Structure 1
Amino acid sequence: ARTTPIARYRNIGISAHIDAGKTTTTERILFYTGVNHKIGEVHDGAATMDWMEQEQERGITITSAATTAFWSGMAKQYEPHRINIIDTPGHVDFTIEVERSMRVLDGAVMVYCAVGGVQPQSETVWRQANKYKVPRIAFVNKMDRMGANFLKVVNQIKTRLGANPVPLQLAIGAEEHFTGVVDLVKMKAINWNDADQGVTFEYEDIPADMVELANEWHQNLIESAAEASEELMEKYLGGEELTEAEIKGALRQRVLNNEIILVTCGSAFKNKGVQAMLDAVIDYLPSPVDVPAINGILDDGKDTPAERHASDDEPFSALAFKIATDPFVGNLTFFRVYSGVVNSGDTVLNSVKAARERFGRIVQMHANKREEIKEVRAGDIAAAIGLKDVTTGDTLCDPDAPIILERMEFPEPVISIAVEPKTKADQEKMGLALGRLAKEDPSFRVWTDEESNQTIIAGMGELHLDIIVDRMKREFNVEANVGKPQVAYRETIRQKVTDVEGKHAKQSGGRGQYGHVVIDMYPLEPGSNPKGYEFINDIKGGVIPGEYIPAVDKGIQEQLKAGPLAGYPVVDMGIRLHFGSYHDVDSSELAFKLAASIAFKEGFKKAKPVLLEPIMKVEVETPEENTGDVIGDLSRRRGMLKGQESEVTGVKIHAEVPLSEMFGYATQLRSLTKGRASYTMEFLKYDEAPSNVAQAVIEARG
């Protein structure tokens, strides 16, 4: 259950790119945050890390196991209480999945690489994410590298990323000589004694050269503080100091309303100063007392808004935010509970795609061990094993309770890389992989037809698109750059060609058999009709018996579709029977079969096909410097632009690129637009190559 309230639960996130040191930071975070490691072991280097060599590492951490990394006061700095770290992303570009993750955690820590300032991947996510409301503080990681002073990092946060950053800490040292962080809000300067933690820390000097910096950064804190409240702004403007309480109040207010991004420092790679930053997360970033609710609308229509609020007494409601497939009893669907309670062996509702769920066994996954539990309370987080239709983003509620708590579904945009077989051997291996992918992830995308036209593969998360594509090409093999997209066509063949004669006038077969037709094929409108097809009798029964004109005609029609054309039947062509001969007062089944046969042998040879190829709406969103480069990608990919409008950090080019002309589109697009693009690919139309589509694509291409 729980004993600590909603307020003394801290749903916090880490939004951190790869560049901050993905591996190192995650191991250190699991150690740092309120014990999720073996008892003690906090002084001198390697001994700190004995916990992970013995059992499980990485994850997302429920913390407060009450034996290491605590503080003396209740809800003051570290712990005495539960802190749940649900991860946030800040990699590549913003997506609905990125948005969805940011909302489960109530506060977030944006992490930057110090040397890189703000790298491309961080900015694109941030501006878009801000629009949909996300409160963040900034953690200048990797202070063991360059940029290990406030001025370099801070200019990038304003310029690249568009936030208002401001100093509130001064660093002690820079690069390898960095060893300390000065807290300009608690007015201590701290030297950390270990490269893991910093236990037996020495409150130390601020070097003479940095006294000035520290005072300026304190002043920058006051300026930032004063903006919070009109009263403070008066005091600041005249000169009057904003005391410890005033600044503290301002920090809480501005972070929760996302009016600022506080800048802090500490390396999590040299592993000094991280701890000071994490205390501030607990103090000032949101908790479930600020988000006890989850708000929907009815699942039946959109008739009325319905609001949930935390209370065990109130019915269950939880949002599932991740699916893993545990070999124990299958899929574990991690969820955060907002209201009510669920117990093992209950029925719950998937109240957004409208399915009943069997709540089997429920487990809480500590980052070291698996512990089966029987109950979750309001505010608790756990994973249920076995659910019918609750997956990532999907809503769990009590046995029955319609309510849309999923405001961005598990099916996600078609951003694809193409996995291509080349040999029948590769086609066989492909089939096994696709079946397997569907069962673990129902919200992946595939494009396929039988034996070829297969596959364009789309994921559902940052790891996911890469993981699925890699396993198919690596483990189960595939010989790239051949087949990849589903198709379907009709002919639209037209041409005014007066003649083809089929004349049979022999004694074969059986009795004497005679059938003779001359047909004129003349243009008929190139429709989207798969049937086609207009028949006119210029001369009716005088050229083949009136009673027999459909049988003869039907025999050629069937046969013609099989002959030289386009692989799609004679469709949207007009055919005129205008001459022929034969006994118009006699017929037999045999006569039409011979008549049709000879007619078909002549008939295939003359006409002029016109048909269609699929054109894909390719909407590409990339950072604005790539307006050039998207058009360049299109040129190499016989594609064109039909409008291009700015969208936040990026430009949104509304391009039309043939579906047919993809070469593993994400890979090509990334190469030409320097890794910064994202795209969706939806069918636009099949096209006759219209003037705008053909000219524009060719135009880009040269």
Structure 2
Amino acid sequence: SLHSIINPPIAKIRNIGIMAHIDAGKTTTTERILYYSGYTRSLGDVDDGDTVTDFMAQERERGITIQSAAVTFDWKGYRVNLIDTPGHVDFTLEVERCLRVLDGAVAVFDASAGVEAQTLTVWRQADKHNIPRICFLNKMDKTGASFKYAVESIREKLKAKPLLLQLPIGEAKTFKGVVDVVMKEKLLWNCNSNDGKDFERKPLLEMNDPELLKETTEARNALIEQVADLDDEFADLVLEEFSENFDLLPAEKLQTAIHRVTLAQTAVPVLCGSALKNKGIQPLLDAVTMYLPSPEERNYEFLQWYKDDLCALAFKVLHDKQRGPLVFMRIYSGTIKPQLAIHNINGNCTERISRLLLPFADQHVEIPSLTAGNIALTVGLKHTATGDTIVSSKSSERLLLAGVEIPEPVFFCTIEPPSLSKQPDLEHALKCLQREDPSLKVRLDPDSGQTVLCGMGELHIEIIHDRIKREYGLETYLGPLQVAYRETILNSVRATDTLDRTLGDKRHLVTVEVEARPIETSSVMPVIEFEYAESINEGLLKVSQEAIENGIHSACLQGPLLGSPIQDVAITLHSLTIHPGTSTTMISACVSRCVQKALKKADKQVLEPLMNLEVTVARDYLSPVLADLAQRRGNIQEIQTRQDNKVVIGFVPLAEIMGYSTVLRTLTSGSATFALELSTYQAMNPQDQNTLLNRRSGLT
């Protein structure tokens, strides 16, 4: 309907992003907004439906938003770019990229929800990015909804003073309207689709409902008190002109004060509503256009330094087959043009802009011209990095913009191609996925070099696997990471062996007396090291010596308990009686057999890899975290009571951190972090060694 839209100036353009908890209504709210703007013609649902937003097959089948959707639309004299963020704990990279690219946030809460710790963590991210936010209390039609309880929870456990701007009529399936505070009006909705195509304005029922009047005027007085206590200039105005009036003015200076407290990072305007019942979306859009920042309302140091150049920030990438390498960016300074050479700051190289357009997330429109403060999609940028600056003419120690930091992925899996012939396809798909999502690290394991995936969570790994299966066509298999054990001997043991092989010509005889003992310089030589001591015999060992080294190395590569490498032993050759004409290969075979027998009859011991676990949690969750660490055999090294946090530093084996991120998040309700780094190899006590051996052998 209204697909053709006109670009506007800075004061009439806004860019914002929607954040909330999982299943809080971001996609539904965006769909309702598009339906009211006219771009969307038919009203659908996420269950059945799933219109322009969440266009992927995985997002349609799982009922969740995986990747952020960028949309552009027009309100009454306002052109606004919206970003529907995923809102999961495993897509915090996407959330942070969409917060960093542009300012302005809409934090959606559920009335009968509480804190919804994902909302808390996205709130912390937005606070770190220093962007204004507006609170939208959705799901007002759901049973058990409580606007007052939600506001109290926001005040208490979010640590931010809210500014109530709307009062709902009902809570439990009787929320049929809202009452505005700044305008002193009531908005009603009586229909199924679009709820009358508009909102019905009958201000406070024309001086007829005393209870509604008293509640509305008390709410207005409270809002005026809050804004006056927050802002100083508005406090001065209230002091000077409208003190005893308590009715300052309808919508000019009160709205100015609320805009100032929105932009001053000291207040969030709270508006109730319900997207599914098509209620409050138009008031939400009005408040978005009246309060949320324009691109230049915040004094950008980058723009202040340079505005005549073409500084822009490429923040997202896409690898669609037909389009090619697509780049989502934000234009900061100047007006950008297609088919013009552009320069990168990180890659100090020139790129040709094949074409440029505006994202509506389902089709290409090929917008010819775009100005500053706009989200744009560019085609043909093959050489692109996740965080980089793009300029023109190279005006200027470098014009580099701090982009997106890798969130240090914590969950580990191993990917399995179905065949060696299909392995190149898997590697190409993994490279494409790595260049798309920088939080999905792929590494090669040092020992038993399988290809491993490092992601943010089990859901992230599962959806990456599904995307690989669907988009590239590979039936791959996931598996737990393998633990590289080591082996050692506990007591010195002797061994003898004799080798004869009469093949005809070249008769030979080897007789080896050797003994293997534990070494003492394990800390001196933490790497896999061996001591090689030959006794005083035979007077000359060069080829025999080389055969000795080769054979004993081959014997040590394989262990007699778990097939694991052996380390930290001393092998001493007591006798090496050879016959004239022996081959060095047969000598090495004899010595390998003798050493294998010695290590077999040696009271062997197995060693596990040990690393540093650094866990950051709260205080009410420290006890379960410590209990789980002790269950998984973590020796606590230190505990530090940080400011409103607790950091535990301990030593935990590799074999006992299988899927630790999921368990930690379950125990801490998602509010916990941990870091790992391998330090040394420790020796198991006999109890754990026997337990591991029994597990590996089955039940016996």
TM-score interval, smaller chain: 0.7 to 0.9
1:116-139 Cα distance to aligned partner (Å, 9 max, x none): 243332123324532442311211
CA distance in 2 between partners of 1:21 and 1:537 (Å): 75
Aligned counterpart, 2:492: 497
CA distance in 2 between partners of 1:54 and 1:627 (Å): 41
TM score, norm. by length of structure 1:
0.78
Residue 63 of structure 1 aligns with an amino acid whose one-letter code is F
Q: How does 1:217-366 map to 2 (within 5 A)?
A: 217-230=219-232, 232-233=234-235, 240=244, 241=246, 243-244=248-249, 245-291=252-298, 293=300, 295=302, 311=307, 314-352=308-346, 356-366=350-360
1:131-169 Cα distance to aligned partner (Å, 9 max, x none): 442311211112223565642221110123221123232
Give 1:10 deviation, angstroms.
Answer: 1.1
Aligned counterpart, 1:484: 480
CA distance in 2 between partners of 1:29 and 1:417 (Å): 39
Question: CA contact under 8 A between 2:331 and 2:373: conserved in structure 1?
Answer: yes
Give 1:266 deviation, angstroms.
Answer: 2.0
Q: Specify every segment of 5 or more residues in structure 2 that has no aligned partner in the other structure, as ranges.
A: 55-68, 693-700
Aligned counterpart, 1:190: 187
Question: CA contact under 8 A between 2:27 and 2:53: conserved in structure 1?
Answer: no
CA distance in 1 between partners of 2:380 and 2:549 (Å): 57
Question: CA contact under 8 A between 1:146 and 1:175: conserved in structure 2?
Answer: yes
Give 1:514 deviation, angstroms.
Answer: 4.5
Q: Cα distance 1:461–1:36, how it changes in 2: closer, same or farther (>3 A)?
A: farther
Aligned counterpart, 1:43: none
Aligned counterpart, 1:216: 218
Aligned with 1:378 (options 362, 372, 378):
372
Q: Cα distance 1:463–1:399, how it changes in 2: closer, same or farther (>3 A)?
A: farther
Residues 1:36 and 2:39 aligned together:
yes
CA distance in 2 between partners of 1:418 and 1:370 (Å): 36
Aligned to 2:409, the other structure's residue is in SS state coil
Aligned to 2:288, the other structure's residue is in SS state helix
CA distance in 2 between partners of 1:91 and 1:386 (Å): 31
Aligned counterpart, 1:301: none
Residue 61 of structure 1 aligns with an amino acid whose one-letter code is V
Question: CA contact under 8 A between 2:319 and 2:432: conserved in structure 1?
Answer: no
Give 1:262 deviation, angstroms.
Answer: 1.9
Aligned with 1:532 (options 526, 529, 535):
529
1:529-551 Cα distance to aligned partner (Å, 9 max, x none): 65623323331435xx4566524
Aligned counterpart, 1:415: 410
Give 1:289 deviation, angstroms.
Answer: 1.3
Residue 570 of structure 2 aligns with an amino acid whose one-letter code is G
Question: CA contact under 8 A between 1:316 and 1:398: conserved in structure 2?
Answer: yes
Q: Specify every segment of 5 or more residues in structure 1 that has no aligned partner in the other structure, as ranges.
A: 39-45, 71-79, 296-306
Aligned to 2:105, the other structure's residue is in SS state strand
CA distance in 2 between partners of 1:477 and 1:573 (Å): 44
Q: Cα distance 1:514–1:620, how it changes in 2: closer, same or farther (>3 A)?
A: same
Q: More deviation in 386-395 or 114-123? A: 386-395
Aligned counterpart, 1:15: 19
Give 1:259 deviation, angstroms.
Answer: 0.3
Aligned counterpart, 1:303: none
Aligned to 1:130, the other structure's residue is in SS state helix
Give 1:30 deviation, angstroms.
Answer: 1.6
Question: CA contact under 8 A between 2:610 and 2:682: conserved in structure 1?
Answer: no
CA distance in 2 between partners of 1:486 and 1:294 (Å): 49
TM score, norm. by length of structure 2:
0.78
Residues 1:102 and 2:99 aligned together:
yes
Aligned counterpart, 1:577: 573
Give 1:28 deviation, angstroms.
Answer: 0.2
Q: How does 1:159-174 map to 2 (within 5 A)?
A: 159-174=156-171
Aligned counterpart, 1:77: none
Question: CA contact under 8 A between 2:483 and 2:654: conserved in structure 1?
Answer: no
Q: Cα distance 1:418–1:382, how it changes in 2: closer, same or farther (>3 A)?
A: same
CA distance in 1 between partners of 2:310 and 2:369 (Å): 12
CA distance in 1 between partners of 2:383 and 2:663 (Å): 35
Q: Cα distance 1:15–1:511, how it changes in 2: closer, same or farther (>3 A)?
A: closer
Residues 1:205 and 2:201 aligned together:
no
Residues 1:605 and 2:597 aligned together:
yes
Aligned counterpart, 2:698: none
Give 1:465 deviation, angstroms.
Answer: 4.8
CA distance in 2 between partners of 1:504 and 1:174 (Å): 90
Residue 103 of structure 1 aligns with an amino acid whose one-letter code is R
Give 1:193 deviation, angstroms.
Answer: 4.1
Question: CA contact under 8 A between 2:35 and 2:43: conserved in structure 1?
Answer: no
Aligned to 2:12, the other structure's residue is in SS state coil
Q: Cα distance 1:12–1:580, how it changes in 2: closer, same or farther (>3 A)?
A: closer
CA distance in 1 between partners of 2:630 and 2:130 (Å): 37
Q: Cα distance 1:346–1:292, how it changes in 2: closer, same or farther (>3 A)?
A: farther
CA distance in 2 between partners of 1:210 and 1:268 (Å): 24
Q: Cα distance 1:387–1:175, how it changes in 2: closer, same or farther (>3 A)?
A: same
CA distance in 2 between partners of 1:3 and 1:162 (Å): 38
Question: CA contact under 8 A between 1:501 and 1:599: conserved in structure 2?
Answer: no
